[PDB]
Amino acid sequence: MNSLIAQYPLVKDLVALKETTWFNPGTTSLAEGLPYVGLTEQDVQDAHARLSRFAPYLAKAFPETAATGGIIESELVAIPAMQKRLEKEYQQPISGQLLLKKDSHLPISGSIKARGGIYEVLAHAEKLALEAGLLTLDDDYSKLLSPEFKQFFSQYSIAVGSTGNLGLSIGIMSARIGFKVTVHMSADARAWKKAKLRSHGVTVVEYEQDYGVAVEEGRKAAQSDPNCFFIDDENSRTLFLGYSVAGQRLKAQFAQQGRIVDADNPLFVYLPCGVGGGPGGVAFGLKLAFGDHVHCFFAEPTHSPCMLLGVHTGLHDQISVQDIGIDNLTAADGLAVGRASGFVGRAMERLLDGFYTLSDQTMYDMLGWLAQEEGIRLEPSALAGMAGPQRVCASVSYQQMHGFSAEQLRNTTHLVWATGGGMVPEEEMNQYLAKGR
């Protein structure tokens, strides 16, 4: 701990809550890193194909998706006005072009969890219906909307411990399928989230104290309860694969928009990081899409640097931020995770270029500037990636490490991955806007 600090001087900066940037000196080629992921392009394509089978279902189940034929995807937009504002405010040029991926605006649940969380639920539904002999892979999955199917899914239950987007996404999707669903939340969690889940028929259970203990107790009660599936965001490869679908979806958007990614036109992507499933899965999908020419960076609150700590020390989930005296208290509630994933750090470290932290105030400030400059309103967690471009462009050592020429830097695309905000009510959004400077 001080034993850690002695071996890893960077840990002093973390304990001091200093905004920190760590470039990974151990990245590898895609070919060299792939064996360690434990998943393949075929696994990723099976996820695309599964979401395709569900498209006719989703188009009917969630009519908000009818216009996209039941595909759950988000806009890729250019934010050059925000680019200029960031350059002005932090006095660091951003080379090339700044873009924003609006996972904050995915349909159904308005966050990145509309990828992994929804996918997990649909995969579970499909597996059950297939094993029951009620569905085949060639069926029109619209049939899952029937009263008979709703009865069938009601014979199984799903539970989540989440006060945020994971619970919102899993709850909404599971209730529509017809599972019995329970979301376990602290009593202090925002009313609008509980109202929303309840409006969808989700049972929201609240705990006035010992919430973390409550979730562990729920997870154990489910562990030996055969028809309850308690979501495990620390270990689920299915969540990870659901997120990874973003890689080819993004590649297709770049192609449509006429945007090149190659050795002479690198893509740098900046991904907010909680437990690591979301950014890790997205990063894996990106690497399969773009190979060595995409460079991914994870972004965490200074009060919650669990993945940076885990990868930097090589301890991964064997260490928590609380182990080094950091409080895990942050306005970035989607990122307030004290211990990294059970598998993402080891799976992905060879394929991740860097990890950095930013303070709550920095998130609030940028949140305001983005509303002012681009008219896009996000939750604080979804601004973590927005600091990334200037961390990278400021670092000569990173650039020399990878051998970027000034011309490559000029032709770089910087993509900030926005992860939530679209479903946040006006009141809460106004509160976020009031906190920036």
Chain residues binding ligand PLP by CB under 6 A are: 111-113, 164-165, 272-279, 334-335, 337, 379, 381-382, 419-420
Rounded distance between C-alpha atoms, residue 39 and residue 42, angstroms: 8
- For K ion, the binding residues (CB under 5 A) are 273, 300, 306-307, 337
From ligand PLP, K ion, none, which one binds at residue 277 (CB under 5 to 8 Å depending on kind)?
ligand PLP
Shortest distance (Å) from residue 105 CB to K ion: 22
Gyration radius from the chain CA atoms = 21
Cβ at position 219, least distance to ligand PLP in Å: 16
Q: Which residues contact 419 (CB under 8 A, 6 or more apart)?
A: 103, 104, 111, 112, 165, 271, 272, 278, 334, 381, 382, 385
- Under 8 Å CB-to-CB from 32, ≥6 apart: which residues? 350
Nearest approach, Cβ of residue 344 and ligand PLP (Å):
8
**Which 3-state string (H, E, C) describes 103-158?**
HHHCCCCCECHHHHHHHHHHHHHHHHHHHCCCCCCCCCHHHHHCHHHHHHHHCCEE
Q: Which does 165 bind (CB under 5 to 8 A by kind): ligand PLP, K ion, none?
A: ligand PLP
Instruction: Give dist(CA 394, CA 391) in Å, integer.
Output: 5
Nearer to K ion by Cβ, of 194 and 339: the residue is: 339
Question: Which one of K ion, ligand PLP, none is in contact with 86 (Cβ closer than 5 to 8 A by kind)?
Answer: none
Q: State the residue for tokens 């925002």.
A: 190
> What value, to the nearest 5°, has the Cα angle with vertex 79 and ends 78 and 85?
160
- Tell me the three state secondary structure of residue 78: strand
The residue among 76 and 424 lying less far from ligand PLP, judged by its C-beta, is 424
Q: Tell me the CA end-to-end span of the chain in Å, nearest whole number.
A: 35
Residue 280's nearest CA partner among 42, 67, 37 is: 37
Query: Based on CB atoms, which residue is closest to ligand PLP, 324 or 423?
Result: 423
Nearer to K ion, 197 or 337 (CB): 337
185 binds, among ligand PLP, K ion, none (CB under 5 to 8 A by kind): none
- Which residue, 202 or 378, has its beta carbon nearer to ligand PLP? 378
CB of 169 to ligand PLP, least distance (A): 8
Q: What SS3 state is found at 171?
A: helix
Looking at the Cβ atoms of 61 and 383, the one nearer to ligand PLP is 383
Amino acid at 110: G
Minimum distance, C-beta of residue 422 to ligand PLP, in the bound complex (Å): 10
Listing DSSP states for 198-224 in one string gives: HHTT-EEEEESS-HHHHHHHHHHHHHT
**For ligand PLP, the closer CB: 304 or 412:** 304
Choose from ligand PLP, K ion, none: what does 359 bind? Cβ within 5-8 Å by kind: none
* Identity at 291, one-letter amino acid code: G
With 0-12 / 13-18 / 19 or more C-beta atoms within 10 angstroms meaning exposed / middle / buried, residue 135 is buried
Are the C-beta atoms of residues 186 and 162 closer than 8 Å to each other?
no
Give the list of residues 6+ apart from residue 135 with CB closer than 8 angstroms, or none: 126, 129, 141, 143, 144
Residue 98 partner contact from ligand PLP, K ion, none using kind-dependent CB cut-offs of 5 to 8 Å: none
> Cβ distance 412 to 267 under 8 Å?
yes
How near is the Cβ of 298 to ligand PLP at its closest, in Å?
8
Say which entry of K ion, ligand PLP, none residue 272 contacts (CB below 5 to 8 A, set by partner kind): ligand PLP
In angstroms, the CA 142 to CA 69 distance is 12
Per partner kind, with CB cut-offs from 5 to 8 A, the member of ligand PLP, K ion, none near residue 111 is ligand PLP
State the minimum distance, in angstroms, from the CB of residue 104 to ligand PLP. 7
Q: Whose Cβ is closer to ligand PLP: residue 61's or residue 282's?
A: 282
Nearer to ligand PLP, 24 or 95 (CB): 24
Nearest CB to ligand PLP, comparing residues 234 and 292: 234
Kindly report the length of the chain.
Answer: 437
Q: Least CB distance from residue 179 to K ion, whole Å?
A: 29
Shortest gap between Cβ of 13 and ligand PLP (angstroms)? 22
Nearer CB in complex with ligand PLP: 272/389: 272
From the list K ion, ligand PLP, none, pick the one residue 306 interacts with, judged by a Cβ distance below 5 to 8 Å according to partner type: K ion
Q: Which does 381 bind (CB under 5 to 8 A by kind): ligand PLP, K ion, none?
A: ligand PLP
Partner in contact with 300, chosen from ligand PLP, K ion, none, beta carbon below 5 to 8 Å by kind? K ion
Of all residues in the shown chain, the one whose CB is closest to ligand PLP is 274
Task: Find the shortest distance in angstroms from Cβ 306 to K ion.
Answer: 4
Query: Least distance to K ion from the beta carbon of 432, Å?
Result: 20
